[PDB]
Protein backbone atom coordinates (compact mmCIF):
# COMPACT_ATOMS: atom_id res chain seq x y z
CA UNK A 1 0.00 0.00 0.00
CA UNK A 2 1.58 2.80 -1.05
CA UNK A 3 3.84 5.42 1.48
CA UNK A 4 5.97 8.04 1.50
CA UNK A 5 7.84 8.04 5.00
CA UNK A 6 9.52 11.55 5.00
CA UNK A 7 12.29 12.87 7.64
CA UNK A 8 12.49 14.56 10.48
CA UNK A 9 12.02 18.38 11.48
CA UNK A 10 14.71 20.99 10.63
CA UNK A 11 15.67 23.88 12.22
CA UNK A 12 18.43 25.83 10.11
CA UNK A 13 19.63 28.98 9.77
CA UNK A 14 19.59 31.76 7.36
CA UNK A 15 21.79 31.02 4.22
CA UNK A 16 22.37 27.39 5.52
CA UNK A 17 21.29 24.35 3.37
CA UNK A 18 18.63 21.70 4.44
CA UNK A 19 18.02 18.01 2.56
CA UNK A 20 14.46 15.97 3.49
CA UNK A 21 14.65 12.27 2.15
CA UNK A 22 11.28 10.48 1.23
CA UNK A 23 11.19 6.72 1.20
CA UNK A 24 9.04 5.14 -0.88
CA UNK A 25 6.88 1.98 -0.37
CA UNK A 26 4.46 -0.50 -2.05
CA UNK A 27 5.03 0.53 -5.46
CA UNK A 28 7.46 -0.02 -8.07
CA UNK A 29 9.97 3.59 -7.56
CA UNK A 30 11.56 3.84 -10.74
CA UNK A 31 8.18 3.67 -12.97
CA UNK A 32 6.86 7.26 -11.58
CA UNK A 33 8.22 10.71 -10.43
CA UNK A 34 8.24 12.30 -7.57
CA UNK A 35 7.31 16.31 -6.99
CA UNK A 36 7.71 18.65 -3.95
CA UNK A 37 5.10 20.69 -2.40
CA UNK A 38 5.76 22.81 0.44
CA UNK A 39 2.95 24.97 3.15
CA UNK A 40 4.16 27.67 5.07
CA UNK A 41 2.26 28.26 8.30
CA UNK A 42 -1.22 29.13 7.78
CA UNK A 43 -0.74 29.13 4.34
CA UNK A 44 -1.47 27.44 1.25
CA UNK A 45 0.55 24.76 -0.87
CA UNK A 46 3.49 25.95 -3.61
CA UNK A 47 4.76 23.19 -5.89
CA UNK A 48 8.65 23.26 -6.12
CA UNK A 49 9.54 20.75 -8.87
CA UNK A 50 9.32 17.75 -10.11
CA UNK A 51 12.02 14.86 -10.91
CA UNK A 52 11.26 11.67 -12.99
CA UNK A 53 12.95 8.42 -11.21
CA UNK A 54 13.84 6.43 -14.44
CA UNK A 55 16.12 9.31 -16.18
CA UNK A 56 16.81 12.09 -13.61
CA UNK A 57 14.72 14.81 -15.30
CA UNK A 58 13.83 17.59 -13.31
CA UNK A 59 11.51 20.36 -13.75
CA UNK A 60 12.18 23.29 -11.04
CA UNK A 61 9.89 26.44 -9.76
CA UNK A 62 11.42 29.53 -11.27
CA UNK A 63 11.35 31.35 -8.11
CA UNK A 64 13.55 28.41 -6.63
CA UNK A 65 15.89 27.90 -9.94
CA UNK A 66 19.57 27.47 -8.89
CA UNK A 67 18.64 27.24 -4.94
CA UNK A 68 16.74 23.66 -5.29
CA UNK A 69 18.13 20.27 -6.44
CA UNK A 70 15.98 17.31 -6.44
CA UNK A 71 17.67 13.84 -6.83
CA UNK A 72 16.49 10.15 -6.26
CA UNK A 73 18.42 7.04 -5.32
CA UNK A 74 16.39 4.18 -7.36
CA UNK A 75 18.44 1.38 -5.38
CA UNK A 76 16.77 2.74 -2.33
CA UNK A 77 13.41 3.95 -3.83
CA UNK A 78 14.28 7.17 -2.06
CA UNK A 79 13.94 10.94 -3.62
CA UNK A 80 15.67 14.04 -1.76
CA UNK A 81 14.85 17.45 -1.85
CA UNK A 82 18.48 20.17 -0.66
CA UNK A 83 17.26 23.85 -0.33
CA UNK A 84 19.90 26.26 -0.62
CA UNK A 85 21.04 29.50 1.05
CA UNK A 86 17.99 29.41 2.95
CA UNK A 87 15.81 31.96 3.97
CA UNK A 88 13.19 33.01 6.73
CA UNK A 89 10.20 32.23 4.28
CA UNK A 90 11.45 29.14 3.37
CA UNK A 91 9.86 27.99 7.11
CA UNK A 92 7.41 25.61 5.87
CA UNK A 93 6.02 22.10 5.90
CA UNK A 94 7.70 20.31 2.85
CA UNK A 95 5.98 17.15 1.32
CA UNK A 96 7.21 14.70 -1.22
CA UNK A 97 4.28 13.47 -3.86
CA UNK A 98 3.84 10.79 -6.03
CA UNK A 99 3.29 11.41 -10.04
CA UNK A 100 2.12 8.88 -12.56
CA UNK A 101 4.10 8.91 -15.19
CA UNK A 102 2.49 9.57 -18.83
CA UNK A 103 -0.90 11.12 -17.74
CA UNK A 104 -2.06 13.76 -20.03
CA UNK A 105 -2.49 15.43 -16.74
CA UNK A 106 0.05 15.06 -14.19
CA UNK A 107 -1.55 14.82 -10.65
CA UNK A 108 -0.37 14.15 -7.16
CA UNK A 109 -2.09 11.07 -6.01
CA UNK A 110 -0.07 10.27 -2.84
CA UNK A 111 1.53 12.49 -0.40
CA UNK A 112 4.16 11.90 2.17
CA UNK A 113 3.63 12.87 5.87
CA UNK A 114 5.65 16.54 5.77
CA UNK A 115 8.68 17.42 7.38
CA UNK A 116 8.47 20.74 9.10
CA UNK A 117 11.98 22.94 8.25
CA UNK A 118 12.64 26.14 10.13
CA UNK A 119 14.78 28.75 9.16
CA UNK A 120 15.94 30.92 11.58
CA UNK A 121 18.63 33.06 13.24
CA UNK A 122 16.89 32.42 17.03
CA UNK A 123 18.99 30.80 19.61
CA UNK A 124 17.45 27.82 21.29
CA UNK A 125 15.32 29.26 24.59
CA UNK A 126 12.89 28.02 26.49
CA UNK A 127 10.16 29.25 27.55
CA UNK A 128 8.94 31.37 30.70
CA UNK A 129 5.82 30.41 32.10
CA UNK A 130 2.74 32.87 33.15
CA UNK A 131 -0.39 32.59 35.29
CA UNK A 132 -3.55 33.40 33.46
CA UNK A 133 -5.15 33.75 36.89
CA UNK A 134 -8.52 33.42 37.26
CA UNK A 135 -9.82 36.18 38.65
CA UNK A 136 -14.07 38.21 38.68
CA UNK A 137 -13.06 39.31 34.94
CA UNK A 138 -12.36 35.70 34.24
CA UNK A 139 -15.88 34.75 35.39
CA UNK A 140 -18.72 34.00 33.90
CA UNK A 141 -22.06 32.62 35.53
CA UNK A 142 -20.45 29.92 37.61
CA UNK A 143 -17.78 29.31 35.63
CA UNK A 144 -13.97 30.89 34.94
CA UNK A 145 -11.52 30.66 32.63
CA UNK A 146 -7.47 30.29 33.55
CA UNK A 147 -4.70 29.58 31.84
CA UNK A 148 -0.85 29.47 31.31
CA UNK A 149 1.41 32.16 28.74
CA UNK A 150 3.91 29.91 27.19
CA UNK A 151 6.33 33.51 26.43
CA UNK A 152 9.40 33.87 24.25
CA UNK A 153 11.12 30.09 23.16
CA UNK A 154 12.34 28.82 20.35
CA UNK A 155 12.09 26.47 18.30
CA UNK A 156 8.54 24.73 18.05
CA UNK A 157 7.14 22.38 20.13
CA UNK A 158 5.98 22.82 23.65
CA UNK A 159 4.01 20.20 24.87
CA UNK A 160 1.23 21.72 27.59
CA UNK A 161 -0.66 19.20 29.41
CA UNK A 162 -3.08 20.09 32.64
CA UNK A 163 -2.66 18.32 36.09
CA UNK A 164 -0.90 15.61 34.47
CA UNK A 165 -3.36 14.48 31.10
CA UNK A 166 -6.06 14.18 33.89
CA UNK A 167 -7.50 17.82 33.06
CA UNK A 168 -9.33 17.40 29.25
CA UNK A 169 -12.75 18.98 29.22
CA UNK A 170 -12.67 22.61 28.41
CA UNK A 171 -9.05 22.98 27.79
CA UNK A 172 -8.23 24.85 24.25
CA UNK A 173 -4.05 25.46 23.69
CA UNK A 174 -3.82 27.55 21.27
CA UNK A 175 -1.45 27.52 18.19
CA UNK A 176 2.13 28.90 18.74
CA UNK A 177 2.72 32.67 17.28
CA UNK A 178 5.75 33.93 16.02
CA UNK A 179 6.91 37.29 17.62
CA UNK A 180 8.77 39.90 15.77
CA UNK A 181 11.71 38.75 18.13
CA UNK A 182 11.92 35.33 16.65
CA UNK A 183 10.43 33.92 19.04
CA UNK A 184 7.13 31.76 19.61
CA UNK A 185 4.41 32.05 22.30
CA UNK A 186 1.44 30.29 23.07
CA UNK A 187 -1.43 30.44 25.35
CA UNK A 188 -2.97 27.32 27.22
CA UNK A 189 -6.30 28.36 28.82
CA UNK A 190 -9.00 25.83 30.61
CA UNK A 191 -12.48 26.56 31.67
CA UNK A 192 -13.62 25.20 35.51
CA UNK A 193 -16.24 25.44 37.70
CA UNK A 194 -16.05 28.94 39.61
CA UNK A 195 -17.04 27.43 42.96
CA UNK A 196 -13.93 24.98 42.53
CA UNK A 197 -11.13 27.64 42.51
CA UNK A 198 -10.67 27.59 46.12
CA UNK A 199 -11.42 24.01 46.41
CA UNK A 200 -8.95 22.42 43.46
CA UNK A 201 -5.55 22.56 42.17
CA UNK A 202 -4.82 23.85 38.38
CA UNK A 203 -1.88 22.94 36.78
CA UNK A 204 -0.07 23.76 33.74
CA UNK A 205 2.26 21.17 32.15
CA UNK A 206 5.22 22.89 29.67
CA UNK A 207 7.46 20.95 27.71
CA UNK A 208 9.96 22.47 26.00
CA UNK A 209 12.06 19.95 25.08
CA UNK A 210 14.67 21.62 22.56
CA UNK A 211 15.92 23.53 25.34
CA UNK A 212 15.21 20.59 27.64
CA UNK A 213 13.24 22.84 29.58
CA UNK A 214 9.98 21.36 31.68
CA UNK A 215 8.12 23.30 33.78
CA UNK A 216 4.52 22.47 36.14
CA UNK A 217 3.15 26.05 37.17
CA UNK A 218 0.45 26.21 39.31
CA UNK A 219 -2.62 28.95 38.29
CA UNK A 220 -4.13 30.22 41.30
CA UNK A 221 -7.32 32.60 41.76
CA UNK A 222 -6.30 36.33 42.74
CA UNK B 1 2.94 31.21 -17.49
CA UNK B 2 2.32 32.22 -14.07
CA UNK B 3 -1.75 31.14 -13.70
CA UNK B 4 -3.34 32.30 -10.70
CA UNK B 5 -6.21 30.39 -9.34
CA UNK B 6 -8.73 31.57 -7.46
CA UNK B 7 -11.31 29.52 -5.40
CA UNK B 8 -14.92 30.84 -4.43
CA UNK B 9 -16.30 30.73 -1.45
CA UNK B 10 -13.15 31.22 0.57
CA UNK B 11 -15.02 29.06 3.06
CA UNK B 12 -18.34 27.86 3.73
CA UNK B 13 -20.10 25.33 6.59
CA UNK B 14 -22.26 22.94 5.68
CA UNK B 15 -24.16 19.80 7.50
CA UNK B 16 -24.22 16.11 6.46
CA UNK B 17 -26.22 15.44 4.11
CA UNK B 18 -25.88 18.69 2.37
CA UNK B 19 -24.84 19.12 -1.43
CA UNK B 20 -22.04 21.02 -1.45
CA UNK B 21 -20.35 22.72 -4.55
CA UNK B 22 -17.00 24.66 -4.59
CA UNK B 23 -15.59 26.94 -7.34
CA UNK B 24 -12.30 27.75 -8.80
CA UNK B 25 -11.37 29.66 -11.68
CA UNK B 26 -8.12 29.69 -13.16
CA UNK B 27 -6.96 32.79 -14.90
CA UNK B 28 -6.54 31.53 -18.15
CA UNK B 29 -7.59 29.19 -20.39
CA UNK B 30 -6.51 25.50 -18.99
CA UNK B 31 -8.45 23.12 -21.25
CA UNK B 32 -8.90 20.47 -18.11
CA UNK B 33 -5.58 20.03 -16.74
CA UNK B 34 -6.99 20.83 -13.16
CA UNK B 35 -7.16 18.24 -10.06
CA UNK B 36 -9.17 18.59 -6.78
CA UNK B 37 -7.15 17.99 -3.06
CA UNK B 38 -8.53 17.95 -0.13
CA UNK B 39 -6.45 18.69 3.43
CA UNK B 40 -7.58 17.96 6.66
CA UNK B 41 -5.40 19.97 10.10
CA UNK B 42 -1.71 18.39 10.53
CA UNK B 43 -2.29 15.88 7.80
CA UNK B 44 -1.16 15.60 3.99
CA UNK B 45 -3.27 16.54 1.17
CA UNK B 46 -5.12 13.71 -0.76
CA UNK B 47 -6.06 13.63 -4.28
CA UNK B 48 -9.94 13.44 -4.79
CA UNK B 49 -10.29 14.52 -8.88
CA UNK B 50 -7.87 14.81 -11.57
CA UNK B 51 -8.08 16.04 -15.24
CA UNK B 52 -11.34 18.03 -13.99
CA UNK B 53 -13.70 14.87 -13.83
CA UNK B 54 -12.19 12.03 -13.22
CA UNK B 55 -13.10 10.33 -10.25
CA UNK B 56 -9.44 8.89 -8.20
CA UNK B 57 -8.95 5.18 -7.08
CA UNK B 58 -10.77 4.94 -3.83
CA UNK B 59 -12.46 8.26 -3.79
CA UNK B 60 -16.10 7.85 -2.84
CA UNK B 61 -18.87 8.52 -5.68
CA UNK B 62 -20.59 11.31 -4.28
CA UNK B 63 -17.53 13.76 -5.03
CA UNK B 64 -17.73 14.41 -8.63
CA UNK B 65 -15.71 17.58 -11.22
CA UNK B 66 -16.91 19.57 -13.84
CA UNK B 67 -15.32 22.39 -15.88
CA UNK B 68 -16.93 25.17 -17.72
CA UNK B 69 -14.25 27.49 -19.74
CA UNK B 70 -12.25 28.49 -16.90
CA UNK B 71 -14.56 27.60 -14.56
CA UNK B 72 -14.16 24.54 -12.59
CA UNK B 73 -16.60 22.92 -9.79
CA UNK B 74 -15.82 20.41 -6.98
CA UNK B 75 -19.25 18.44 -6.19
CA UNK B 76 -19.76 16.41 -2.69
CA UNK B 77 -23.41 14.94 -3.55
CA UNK B 78 -24.04 14.10 0.17
CA UNK B 79 -21.55 15.30 2.63
CA UNK B 80 -20.52 13.33 5.10
CA UNK B 81 -18.54 13.22 8.63
CA UNK B 82 -14.96 13.20 7.03
CA UNK B 83 -15.36 15.48 4.30
CA UNK B 84 -15.39 18.34 6.58
CA UNK B 85 -11.51 19.87 5.60
CA UNK B 86 -10.31 22.12 3.17
CA UNK B 87 -10.53 21.42 -0.77
CA UNK B 88 -7.88 23.11 -2.98
CA UNK B 89 -7.86 22.99 -6.73
CA UNK B 90 -4.55 22.44 -8.82
CA UNK B 91 -3.35 23.79 -12.21
CA UNK B 92 -0.76 21.15 -13.87
CA UNK B 93 -0.93 23.25 -17.62
CA UNK B 94 2.00 25.69 -17.06
CA UNK B 95 4.90 25.26 -14.89
CA UNK B 96 4.97 26.53 -12.07
CA UNK B 97 1.90 24.40 -11.30
CA UNK B 98 -0.51 26.46 -8.65
CA UNK B 99 -2.58 25.38 -6.11
CA UNK B 100 -6.01 27.43 -5.46
CA UNK B 101 -6.13 29.24 -2.06
CA UNK B 102 -8.60 26.54 -0.63
CA UNK B 103 -12.24 26.20 0.43
CA UNK B 104 -12.35 25.18 3.93
CA UNK B 105 -15.66 23.55 4.69
CA UNK B 106 -16.45 24.11 8.30
CA UNK B 107 -19.90 22.10 10.40
CA UNK B 108 -22.76 24.08 10.21
CA UNK B 109 -24.34 24.53 13.90
CA UNK B 110 -26.45 27.83 15.42
CA UNK B 111 -25.12 30.93 16.63
CA UNK B 112 -23.02 30.66 19.16
CA UNK B 113 -21.80 34.44 21.21
CA UNK B 114 -18.27 34.31 22.33
CA UNK B 115 -18.14 33.68 26.48
CA UNK B 116 -14.72 36.29 27.07
CA UNK B 117 -12.61 36.53 29.45
CA UNK B 118 -9.78 39.30 30.03
CA UNK B 119 -6.46 38.43 31.83
CA UNK B 120 -4.29 41.33 33.43
CA UNK B 121 -0.39 40.86 32.60
CA UNK B 122 0.96 38.67 35.95
CA UNK B 123 3.05 39.99 38.64
CA UNK B 124 5.51 37.74 37.25
CA UNK B 125 6.32 38.88 33.98
CA UNK B 126 5.47 42.81 34.74
CA UNK B 127 8.64 41.87 36.65
CA UNK B 128 10.74 41.25 33.91
CA UNK B 129 10.10 44.80 31.33
CA UNK B 130 7.34 43.07 29.67
CA UNK B 131 3.07 43.52 30.10
CA UNK B 132 1.42 40.66 28.15
CA UNK B 133 -3.04 41.04 28.48
CA UNK B 134 -4.51 38.50 26.59
CA UNK B 135 -8.25 38.37 25.65
CA UNK B 136 -9.73 34.91 25.32
CA UNK B 137 -13.17 33.69 23.34
CA UNK B 138 -14.16 30.93 24.12
CA UNK B 139 -16.52 28.49 22.06
CA UNK B 140 -18.26 30.97 19.86
CA UNK B 141 -19.76 30.16 15.84
CA UNK B 142 -19.27 31.32 12.95
CA UNK B 143 -15.92 31.97 12.57
CA UNK B 144 -16.10 35.59 11.66
CA UNK B 145 -15.11 37.71 15.02
CA UNK B 146 -13.53 41.24 15.62
CA UNK B 147 -11.41 41.59 18.74
CA UNK B 148 -10.19 45.25 19.03
CA UNK B 149 -8.19 46.45 21.82
CA UNK B 150 -8.10 49.55 23.58
CA UNK B 151 -6.26 51.40 25.99
CA UNK B 152 -7.64 54.43 27.95
CA UNK B 153 -10.52 54.15 25.07
CA UNK B 154 -7.13 54.00 22.41
CA UNK B 155 -7.92 51.96 19.52
CA UNK B 156 -4.59 49.93 19.58
CA UNK B 157 -3.48 48.67 15.95
CA UNK B 158 -0.08 46.77 15.53
CA UNK B 159 0.81 45.30 18.80
CA UNK B 160 -1.31 42.71 19.40
CA UNK B 161 -1.55 39.07 17.78
CA UNK B 162 -4.61 36.55 17.99
CA UNK B 163 -4.81 32.58 17.19
CA UNK B 164 -7.34 30.53 16.95
CA UNK B 165 -8.56 26.82 17.48
CA UNK B 166 -9.86 24.51 14.95
CA UNK B 167 -13.52 23.86 15.55
CA UNK B 168 -14.34 22.00 18.48
CA UNK B 169 -15.19 18.22 18.30
CA UNK B 170 -17.52 17.93 20.99
CA UNK B 171 -19.52 21.58 20.43
CA UNK B 172 -18.37 22.54 16.71
CA UNK B 173 -17.21 26.06 18.15
CA UNK B 174 -13.98 27.91 17.95
CA UNK B 175 -11.97 29.92 20.45
CA UNK B 176 -9.62 32.86 20.05
CA UNK B 177 -7.12 34.20 21.64
CA UNK B 178 -5.53 37.74 21.84
CA UNK B 179 -2.57 39.08 22.90
CA UNK B 180 -1.69 42.60 22.87
CA UNK B 181 2.22 43.13 24.02
CA UNK B 182 2.98 46.11 25.89
CA UNK B 183 6.71 47.21 27.50
CA UNK B 184 6.03 47.50 31.11
CA UNK B 185 7.22 51.34 30.73
CA UNK B 186 4.10 51.81 28.19
CA UNK B 187 1.96 49.26 30.37
CA UNK B 188 2.01 51.42 33.16
CA UNK B 189 1.17 55.02 31.64
CA UNK B 190 -1.73 53.92 31.03
CA UNK B 191 -5.15 52.79 33.42
CA UNK B 192 -8.06 51.20 31.52
CA UNK B 193 -7.00 47.67 29.48
CA UNK B 194 -10.19 47.08 27.13
CA UNK B 195 -10.83 44.11 24.52
CA UNK B 196 -13.70 44.55 22.59
CA UNK B 197 -15.49 41.40 20.68
CA UNK B 198 -17.64 42.05 17.86
CA UNK B 199 -19.24 38.89 16.98
CA UNK B 200 -22.82 38.22 15.43
CA UNK B 201 -24.47 35.93 17.95
CA UNK B 202 -23.77 39.60 20.30
CA UNK B 203 -26.89 42.16 19.46
CA UNK B 204 -23.98 45.16 20.82
CA UNK B 205 -20.16 44.24 21.10
CA UNK B 206 -18.98 43.03 24.07
CA UNK B 207 -16.55 44.59 26.21
CA UNK B 208 -14.33 43.27 28.99
CA UNK B 209 -11.88 45.64 31.04
CA UNK B 210 -10.13 46.30 33.91
CA UNK B 211 -7.99 49.19 35.24
CA UNK B 212 -4.20 48.37 36.00
CA UNK B 213 -3.47 47.92 40.19
CA UNK B 214 -6.91 46.76 40.86
Known amino acids: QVQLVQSGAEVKRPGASVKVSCKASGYTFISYGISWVRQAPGQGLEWMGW????????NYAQNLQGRVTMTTDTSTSTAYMELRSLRSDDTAVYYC??????????????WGQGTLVTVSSASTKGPSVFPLAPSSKSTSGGTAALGCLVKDYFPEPVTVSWNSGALTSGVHTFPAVLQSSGLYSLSSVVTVPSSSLGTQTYICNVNHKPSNTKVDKRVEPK | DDIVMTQSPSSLSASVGDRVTISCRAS??????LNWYQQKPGKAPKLLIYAASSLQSGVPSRFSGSASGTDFTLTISSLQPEDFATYYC?????????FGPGTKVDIERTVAAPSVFIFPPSDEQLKSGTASVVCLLNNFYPREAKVQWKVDNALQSGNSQESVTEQDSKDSTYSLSSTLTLSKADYEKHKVYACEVTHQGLSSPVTKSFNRGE
Open chain 2, 90 to 98: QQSYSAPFT
Open chain 1, 51 to 58: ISAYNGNT
Open chain 1, 97 to 110: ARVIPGTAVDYFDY
Open chain 2, 28 to 33: QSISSY
